Design a protein around this ligand. Sequence first.
Ligand SMILES: NC[C@@H]1O[C@H](O[C@H]2[C@@H](O)[C@H](O[C@@H]3[C@@H](O)[C@H](N)C[C@H](N)[C@H]3O[C@H]3O[C@H](CN)[C@@H](O)[C@H](O)[C@H]3N)O[C@@H]2CO)[C@H](N)[C@@H](O)[C@@H]1O
Ligand SMILES: NC[C@@H]1O[C@H](O[C@H]2[C@@H](O)[C@H](O[C@@H]3[C@@H](O)[C@H](N)C[C@H](N)[C@H]3O[C@H]3O[C@H](CN)[C@@H](O)[C@H](O)[C@H]3N)O[C@@H]2CO)[C@H](N)[C@@H](O)[C@@H]1O
Ligand SMILES: Nc1ncnc2c1ncn2[C@@H]1O[C@H](COP(=O)(O)CP(=O)(O)OP(=O)(O)O)[C@@H](O)[C@H]1O
Ligand SMILES: Nc1ncnc2c1ncn2[C@@H]1O[C@H](COP(=O)(O)CP(=O)(O)OP(=O)(O)O)[C@@H](O)[C@H]1O
Ligand SMILES: [Mg+2]
Ligand SMILES: [Mg+2]
Ligand SMILES: [Mg+2]
Ligand SMILES: [Mg+2]
Lengths: 253, 252
Amino acid sequence: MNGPIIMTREERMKIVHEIKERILDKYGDDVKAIGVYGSLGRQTDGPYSDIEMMCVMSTEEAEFSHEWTTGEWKVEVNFDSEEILLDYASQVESDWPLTHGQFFSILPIYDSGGYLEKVYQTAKSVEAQKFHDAICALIVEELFEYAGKWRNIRVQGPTTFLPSLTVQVAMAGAMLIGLHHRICYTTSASVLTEAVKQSDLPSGYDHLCQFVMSGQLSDSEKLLESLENFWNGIQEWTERHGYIVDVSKRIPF
Amino acid sequence: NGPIIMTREERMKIVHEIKERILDKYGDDVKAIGVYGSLGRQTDGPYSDIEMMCVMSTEEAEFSHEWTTGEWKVEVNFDSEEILLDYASQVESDWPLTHGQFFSILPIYDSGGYLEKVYQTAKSVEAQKFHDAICALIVEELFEYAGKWRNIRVQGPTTFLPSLTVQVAMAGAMLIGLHHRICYTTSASVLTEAVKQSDLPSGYDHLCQFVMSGQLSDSEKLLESLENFWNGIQEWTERHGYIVDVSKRIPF
Ligand SMILES: NC[C@@H]1O[C@H](O[C@H]2[C@@H](O)[C@H](O[C@@H]3[C@@H](O)[C@H](N)C[C@H](N)[C@H]3O[C@H]3O[C@H](CN)[C@@H](O)[C@H](O)[C@H]3N)O[C@@H]2CO)[C@H](N)[C@@H](O)[C@@H]1O
Ligand SMILES: NC[C@@H]1O[C@H](O[C@H]2[C@@H](O)[C@H](O[C@@H]3[C@@H](O)[C@H](N)C[C@H](N)[C@H]3O[C@H]3O[C@H](CN)[C@@H](O)[C@H](O)[C@H]3N)O[C@@H]2CO)[C@H](N)[C@@H](O)[C@@H]1O
Ligand SMILES: Nc1ncnc2c1ncn2[C@@H]1O[C@H](COP(=O)(O)CP(=O)(O)OP(=O)(O)O)[C@@H](O)[C@H]1O
Ligand SMILES: Nc1ncnc2c1ncn2[C@@H]1O[C@H](COP(=O)(O)CP(=O)(O)OP(=O)(O)O)[C@@H](O)[C@H]1O
Ligand SMILES: [Mg+2]
Ligand SMILES: [Mg+2]
Ligand SMILES: [Mg+2]
Ligand SMILES: [Mg+2]
């Protein structure tokens, strides 16, 4: 295969409706709804964009996907029962701002009973405690661990890992901001650009992203200084907004 | 103040305190306790964290405790024997990054060779699972990455190119690790160990130099390096028989 080729929006929609016809032929009355998400669902797909579709099934324990390429383009179709999809849409993980824009993206092509609207309503009505818990977990599970990794790099290397680690920290900060503002990023390319347009950023985040977005990640000393400043801004930011975790016990169970 | 400097001896004081707490709370439901990660290999650095794994007799047991004291951080995983053995034999795209855990285990408590059984399962995974994982990685990740950087070339934004290049270099390291059935030591050594492997895809080493040095500001040279690597993938997969099915427009 020659990799992804240039395709028009008209050609991608022709593939979508061919897939819709095959889905309806194969699964029949078990198909509750079919939608397009991603850049094609918003009709902002570029020349090399891929195709992603979702399907709501009546069958229980239905949870499978077909993801393939023809050599020229690539398609991903997810099949989930209504209960599995609604449960997934109301769970807030650390990468929620990156995954759950799909449920604010849906272009319905087939819907037998407002199922896609019910999915959208569920995803947008998640109670605030779930975001609070996810933010506190993100600090412990990812950010604290990253700080140990770059502090280890400072004292024992290797600096060849620092550029990759810096990108990962900037992405983790984008998740932190996305959970706080309850915004889902449009595409992977817009994660950092949209994260730095949000108000009330932790101190040092925008400066750190400037290194990552510009690609100037060769000055290891300035990166470590930028990472520590971001880490300091995190601790001030979390206390100011009340994302406080009790850390007083050596063993909390 | 973030993670503080700690010695290996101090980390082993914490490991054995947690072991006693696990045995007191869960009692006879504990089959085995081990340390993995850098502490399990006894190569932990001054700021390294602590990760432990526990084998439980309780059916469907699958939970974790992950916390910080403000000075250090600990993660303890609790899994039933069946859940752990199934996970140890399952090969995902990030297998070379995740499953070194099962080649790291420092046993602390074991009532019946359970940690050794997990180790045997992880090292005896069927070769076909790596073949399938490689083909899936190409379709699900690398092909998607190629579309993203080709979109960047024609419409931007180049502000995503440095992060995307890091992700492609990491994916290529997973590809090499899956082919050689090797698990990387730590996340910091993934790229350095990946370029020391024999039979790399053409263009991979050149792409990794940009990522390891941090020189990711030349968007034109990065896009050229990415295309060469992408071209080298097709020669590489054909050479090893990692053939991707492209015959169906709709494969269901
Ligand atoms: N434990 C055995 C198996 O683990 C799986 O989860 C795997 C994976 O999702 C999970 O990843 C978890 C995350 O989720 C969680 N939100 C934060 C946590 N730090 C992270 O932990 C993992 O990633 C860290 C680096 N970022 C590593 O330092 C750490 O040692 C590693 N356990 O760790 C597990 C592998 O170690 C499944 N739970 C289940 O199939 C089974 O229980
Ligand atoms: N479908 C609803 C839910 O999706 C979950 O999976 C989520 C996630 O793991 C999964 O990620 C899958 C991977 O796995 C698979 N190995 C490659 C595939 N490209 C990727 O797809 C996802 O990541 C891509 C970006 N790299 C996106 O382009 C794509 O739109 C997105 N669906 O996509 C889902 C979120 O979009 C669970 N399967 C299940 O809880 C339930 O089915
Ligand atoms: N790593 C990720 N994992 C899961 N979903 C993601 C994701 N990154 C982005 N998304 C969500 O899944 C949708 C499609 O993801 P992608 O195909 O990776 C980029 P896109 O938004 O479709 O534009 P593009 O493919 O033309 O570049 C996004 O619109 C977004 O809602
Ligand atoms: N994303 C990931 N998911 C699951 N396991 C991972 C993982 N990344 C690395 N690992 C596994 O979990 C172990 C511990 O991971 P980490 O704590 O993140 C780095 P380490 O190997 O312990 O050295 P360090 O903590 O001193 O930096 C790794 O050795 C590896 O076996
Ligand atoms: Mg897309
Ligand atoms: Mg996609
Ligand atoms: Mg560790
Ligand atoms: Mg760890």
